[PDB]
Amino acid sequence: GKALVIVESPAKAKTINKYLGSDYVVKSSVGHIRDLPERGALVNRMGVDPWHNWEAHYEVLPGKEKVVSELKQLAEKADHIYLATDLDREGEAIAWHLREVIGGDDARYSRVVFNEITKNAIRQAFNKPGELNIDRVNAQQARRFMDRVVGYMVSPLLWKKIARGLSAGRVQSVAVRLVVEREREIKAFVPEEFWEVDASTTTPSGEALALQVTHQNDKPFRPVNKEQTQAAVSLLEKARYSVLEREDKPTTSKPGAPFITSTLQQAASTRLGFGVKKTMMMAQRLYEAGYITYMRTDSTNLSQDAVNMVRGYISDNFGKKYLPESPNQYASKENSQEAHEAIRPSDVNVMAESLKDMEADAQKLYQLIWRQFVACQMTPAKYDSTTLTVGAGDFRLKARGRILRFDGWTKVMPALRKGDEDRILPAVNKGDALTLVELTPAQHFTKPPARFSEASLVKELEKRGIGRPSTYASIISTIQDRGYVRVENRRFYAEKMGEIVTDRLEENFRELMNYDFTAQMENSLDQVANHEAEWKAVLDHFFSDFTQQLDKAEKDPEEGGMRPNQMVLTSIDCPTCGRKMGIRTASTGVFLGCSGYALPPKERCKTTINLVPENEVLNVLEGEDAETNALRAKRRCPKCGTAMDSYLIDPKRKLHVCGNNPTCDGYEIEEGEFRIKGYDGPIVECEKCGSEMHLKMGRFGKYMACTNEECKNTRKILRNGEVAPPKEDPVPLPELPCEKSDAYFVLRDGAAGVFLAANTFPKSRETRAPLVEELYRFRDRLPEKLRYLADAPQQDPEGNKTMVRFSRKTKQQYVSSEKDGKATGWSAFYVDGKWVEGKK
Ligand SMILES: [Zn+2]
Ligand SMILES: [Zn+2]
Ligand SMILES: [Zn+2]
């Protein structure tokens, strides 16, 4: 009969079915197809029981029903099913799930691995196959379960001790820790002043020669102030300059490795300004159109064919001097493994300019990938480097030059700009005298560590083996949405909440917060994959340690438990009761609170103030200075050397807070005036004062309010529009049930139109317009004006059903019909006491 082959990526399937034709039926799982959804509720939620030998409850993904289904019937007309997922443990597990979802007998299943697309591979695939590795499968189940336990058992602790909506995770929490540590590193940085002196001179001929002072009395020349710099210039001005040595030497430049997911993101970010998510979107398009290989990879390897293809191209398009004697070698990691391959063009002969079916940005990304791939296999660039040593009294001066002799790989990947050594030096020999023209002293300051960028953090994660190609982007977003860090000017900033959570987690879950936790986990997982350990036993050890930490964290702070959030007061008057005010962190952000929150109802105060931070605006034109000056800009805490971070409380007042808050309690208040935002979201203009209006959340769901503290004009969210003017006139219907939820529908009016909405609106958020027949059924409830809509024609000339819509261009209600949810292109309007109907 016909053989059924299953792979992970659809694009790869279509390609396999080709180099195999009919007789076989290739398809793809398009991912995992199945996954997870003492206390019984907790176990039901987790989908795994740590107290019952790890029994689990897998269930098809809410978006793979079709895939699974269409894969079902296909198993009938199939003789022998060939699971062809990736050889790693994740792929191995997808194979295991397929086999248990399709059912059948073990013998009806086979495991095959495809090397490449070449027929020299798709053939050998069925040549010497095998079956699924249970050890590999269990290794992946162990990882998946450990990640589950941590997230579903630690987060709740956070909800109790810190705030609701918070989360913790093996990968997630260390990514934040990295940002938090860099933040503290920057805030504590103190710029150091240092001076440099350069001298312009003339050779015996008359040529110009620029020199840098390197030594004085044989010690590195590095004055720290103007005074010292002057003492030196005074001596250099009177000194005799003579050449000591001229060292001419041939130097080379080497191309880099082809791209992997992390490096592609970094290169796209530095040369094209692309964000991680965007880069992956374009890369995805390119892959699906067959121009490049999978965009998710951690290996820079190249097949022999790939290498012959590129050398073949270099040979015809550049000549011999560009083609190395033998393939360029790189990456010798002894622990390295083999997976898919590096990101490169599927066909070197295809130029970016010929992809007229792709967006311009996708062509730019392709060009980046192409050039990196071709330069990688070309010859080195060759330069003649010259170094001049000069003596002047007790000083030593230097000059370095470089002249390009052969571009090599830079022919395809040019030097964006000339470097400091990309210059020439005049002919001068040892012993020659030099004539001093002028001395230029320069003041400098060391700069703080650079802030992370999305690609930059990804780079750090991969360096420590923390994430995965398919999850890097996802990680960068989660930590933002959770409110732990924020991005500004394409750079990361740690939020107060991130610091709070990072400190708590480090205090009560040190092991989990160690950067190498993943590496250590990988070792144990490999042992399970290699029959050197049993998976349930490994999970049991893990769980025992974890529960020891969790239970300890649950206790009161005095017994070693997790510290619950802490109020730090400050001199500010609560607008409701004037009292001193304190600085607080919630999952929403960092905010100003009044101690009456901790007093029982009688004396309770729920007034709160939002703390707008002063965003650091790094000047790109300052280059390396830009971060140092940012650190200089900050105030410094009175009680400690730690820098201070700055916030706005009034159009007259500004607030400074220490970096080690709340461990350090220093605060400062300044007559500083700037602007303040009530919160953030859909920008709206307040009709009562023209100021910006934002979107806010609270105990009553979502409302819209104006940033001007002098105006409380508040709009609101509605079912099928951006915002609703002030508030409007609603009517409830208990007889219309919701369909996605158990709620009932209510009828509402506004500038947007007339709409149905669910009674638990902030939670249900269910959306639809009313049908004319519905209105006719509840015509008695309709307010007097709305009755006409019930008079409207209930069905169109085709007998389809009709709905009520708002014509914004004419500010009036109309009725329209839909078939298969699409508009029929028919409408009826109300014009002077009559209903008129026709084509849209
Ligand atoms: Zn108060
Ligand atoms: Zn301090
Ligand atoms: Zn307003």
The half-sphere exposure of 56 on its side-chain side, counting CA atoms within 13 A, is 16
Q: Between helices 276-288 and 472-481, what is the axis angle to 10°?
A: 140
Q: What type of residue sits at position 323?
A: L
Q: How far apart are CA 759 and CA 707, in angstroms?
A: 29
Rounded to 5°, the CA angle 121-123-128 comes to 95
Structure tokens at 516: 């190498």
Beta bridge partners of 776: none
Give yes or no for a contact between 111 and 83, defined as CB atoms under 8 angstroms apart: yes
**Ligand that lies nearest to the alpha carbon of residue 664, given by its number in the listed order:** 2
**Ligand that lies nearest to the alpha carbon of residue 663, given by its number in the listed order:** 2
Cα(685) to ligand 3 centroid in Å equals 8
Kindly report the number of other CB atoms within 10 A of residue 587's CB atom: 17
Which one, of 346, 356, 255, 343, lies nearest residue 294 by Cα? 343
Element (H, E) at 106: none
Q: How far apart are CA 656 and CA 669, in angstroms?
A: 6
Structure tokens at 171: 């990968």
End-to-end CA distance of the chain: 54
R_g of the chain computed on alpha carbons: 34
Residue 570 phi, psi dihedral angles, 5° rounding: -165, 160
Residue 333's Cα: distance from chain center in Å?
28
Q: How far apart are CA 657 and CA 583, in angstroms?
A: 9
Cis peptide, bond prior to residue 662, ω within 30 of zero: yes
Strands (E), 713-752: 714-718, 721-724, 731-737, 744-750
**Ligand that lies nearest to the alpha carbon of residue 599, given by its number in the listed order:** 1
Q: What type of residue sits at position 79?
A: D
The half-sphere exposure of 391 on its side-chain side, counting CA atoms within 13 A, is 11
Q: How far apart are CA 240 and CA 253, in angstroms?
A: 37
Could you write out the DSSP letters of every residue in 442-475? EEEE--PPPPP-HHHHHHHHHHTT-S-TTTHHHH
User: Active-site positions?
Assistant: 294
Q: How far apart are CA 46 and CA 554, in angstroms?
A: 19
Cα(107) to ligand 2 centroid in Å equals 69
**Cα–Cα separations (whole angstroms), residue 561 to 400, 503, 598:** 61, 13, 21
**Ligand that lies nearest to the alpha carbon of residue 665, given by its number in the listed order:** 2
Cα(580) to ligand 1 centroid in Å equals 8
811: left (phi over 0), alpha (psi -120 to 50) or beta: left
Strands (E), 547-653: 568-570, 581-586, 589-594, 608-610, 612-613, 644-648
Q: How far apart are CA 710 and CA 219, in angstroms?
A: 64
Which one, of 276, 256, 275, 269, lies nearest residue 469 by Cα? 276
Residue 292's Cα: distance from chain center in Å?
23
Element (H, E) at 282: helix 276-288
Give yes or no for a contact between 487 and 159, defined as CB atoms under 8 angstroms apart: no
**Cα–Cα separations (whole angstroms), residue 404 to 256, 320, 725:** 19, 19, 68
Beta bridge partners of 245: 389
Cα(689) to ligand 3 centroid in Å equals 5
Give yes or no for a contact between 662 and 497, defined as CB atoms under 8 angstroms apart: no
Long-range contacts of the stretch 758-765 (C-beta < 8 A, 24+): 759/732, 761/701, 762/700, 762/701, 762/702, 763/701, 764/738, 764/740, 765/719
Q: How far apart are CA 118 and CA 22, in angstroms?
A: 17
Cα(692) to ligand 3 centroid in Å equals 7
Name residue, tokens 């650091």.
616
Query: What 3-state DSSP class applies to 588?
Result: coil
Rounded to 5°, the CA angle 601-604-608 comes to 140
Structure tokens at 482: 């959770």
CA trace torsion 819, 823, 828, 830 (10° rounding): 120
Which one, of 706, 701, 700, 747, lies nearest residue 728 by Cα? 747
Give yes or no for a contact between 236 and 439, defined as CB atoms under 8 angstroms apart: yes
Q: Which residues contact 351 (CB under 8 A, 6 or more apart)?
A: 370
Known binding-site residues for Mg(2+) equal 8, 86
Q: How far apart are CA 188 and CA 629, in angstroms?
A: 13
Residue 767 phi, psi dihedral angles, 5° rounding: -130, 125
Q: In the 3-class helix/strand/coil scheme, how is 29-43 assigned residue by residue?
A: CCCCCEECCCCHHHH
Method: cryo-EM
Q: Which residues contact 46 (CB under 8 A, 6 or more apart)?
A: 36, 148, 149, 152, 153
Give yes or no for a contact between 587 and 497, defined as CB atoms under 8 angstroms apart: yes
Cα(185) to ligand 2 centroid in Å equals 14
Residue 293's Cα: distance from chain center in Å?
22
**Ligand that lies nearest to the alpha carbon of residue 572, given by its number in the listed order:** 1
Cα(711) to ligand 3 centroid in Å equals 5
Query: What 3-state DSSP class applies to 138?
Result: helix
| Helices first, then strands: H and E counts in the chain | 21, 37
Cα(608) to ligand 1 centroid in Å equals 8
Output the furthest CA–CA distance in the chain (Å, rounded). 109
Q: Which residues contact 756 (CB under 8 A, 6 or more apart)?
A: 719, 736, 745, 746, 747, 748, 768, 769, 770, 774
Q: How far apart are CA 747 and CA 751, in angstroms?
A: 14
Query: What 3-state DSSP class applies to 741?
Result: coil
Q: What type of residue sits at position 58?
A: Y
| DSSP classification of residue 110 | E
Known binding-site residues equal 8, 86
Give yes or no for a contact between 27 and 74, defined as CB atoms under 8 angstroms apart: yes
Q: How far apart are CA 57 and CA 291, in angstroms?
A: 40
Structure tokens at 263: 């490096």
**Ligand that lies nearest to the alpha carbon of residue 575, given by its number in the listed order:** 1
Which one, of 430, 470, 395, 456, lies nearest residue 222 by Cα? 395
Cα(569) to ligand 2 centroid in Å equals 14
Residue 450 phi, psi dihedral angles, 5° rounding: -65, 150
**Cα–Cα separations (whole angstroms), residue 781 to 125, 414, 453, 733, 806:** 70, 74, 57, 8, 21
Q: Between helices 454-463 and 261-272, what is the axis angle to 10°?
A: 150
Q: Pairing between strand 801-807 and 753-758?
A: unpaired
Query: What 3-state DSSP class applies to 376?
Result: coil
Kindly report the number of other CB atoms within 10 A of residue 158's CB atom: 21
Could you write out the DSSP letters of every residue in 628-657? HHHHHHS-B-SSSS-BEEEEE-SSS-EEEE
Cα(454) to ligand 2 centroid in Å equals 29
Query: What 3-state DSSP class applies to 762?
Result: helix
Q: How far apart are CA 36 and CA 101, in angstroms?
A: 14
Q: How far apart are CA 447 and CA 626, in angstroms?
A: 8
Q: Between helices 261-272 and 276-288, what is the axis angle to 10°?
A: 110
